[PDB]
Structure 1
Amino acid sequence: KRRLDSVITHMSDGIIATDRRGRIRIVNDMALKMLGMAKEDIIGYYMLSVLSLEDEFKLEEIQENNDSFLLDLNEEEGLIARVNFSTIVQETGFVTGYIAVLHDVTEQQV
């Protein structure tokens, strides 16, 4: 996690944070609305499976500096999110978790 670019975040963003093993342990309400899912169907499940990426992408491929993935989060309700993955790291460099920031393509700024 050398640059902060992939943790640039806005208040309308969906946030997912996982444990050491990539299982969702934090998910904010916006992420649940983007995903059309319930917190109970999310907590403890694998982030990459919930994001429908488990067969094209694995945790090992989340690098120190990642770019973004454009995802169709809800085809049933026309939502494109640019998705920024990143590792969480303690004081000596070791991965303790993972982050997904879900940016609505149509999100606004000032």
Structure 2
Amino acid sequence: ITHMSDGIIATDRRGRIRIVNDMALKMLGMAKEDIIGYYMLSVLSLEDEFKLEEINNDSFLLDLEGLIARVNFSTIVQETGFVTGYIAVLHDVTEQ
């Protein structure tokens, strides 16, 4: 489940970030101009212990000062079945 206060990142099929909201920028402590175009998993420092193909029901703890945040992933799929992209949802751990 997603909330209004969550960070959101969306990518193309190759995992490059195309959309990121201001809350995600706040949580990551980055500027948009330094995020767009780059690989999501790399931006999140999950580069090794995870890859796109594998996106699962599990939430994960993200290193962030700042916070920790918990993140869950999903795929963007067409009717043809084809995965056209990916979404990360970043939750403040003290959400509630």
Q: Same fold (TM over 0.5)?
A: yes
Q: CA offset at residue 72 of structure 1? A: 2.0
Q: CA offset at residue 86 of structure 1? A: 0.8
Q: Deviations over 1:26-71 (max 9, x none)?
A: 0000000000001011000000000001111111111xx4311111
| TM-score calculated relative to the size of structure 1 | 0.82
Q: CA offset at residue 78 of structure 1? A: 4.3
1:94 maps to which residue?
82
Alpha-carbon contact 1:18-1:47 (below 8 Å) kept? yes
2:24 matches 1:34: no
1:4 maps to which residue?
none
Alpha-carbon contact 1:32-1:39 (below 8 Å) kept? yes
Alpha-carbon contact 1:72-1:78 (below 8 Å) kept? no
Taking the aligned partners of 2:92 and 2:31, their CA distance within structure 1 comes to 19
Q: CA offset at residue 82 of structure 1? A: 1.1
Corresponding residue pairs, total: 95
Question: What residue ranges of structure 1 are gaps of 5+ in the alignment?
Answer: 1-7
Report runs of 4+ in structure 1 exceeding 3 Å deviation.
Answer: none
Structure 1 residue matching 2:41: 3-state secondary structure: helix
Question: What residue ranges of structure 2 are gaps of 5+ in the alignment?
Answer: none
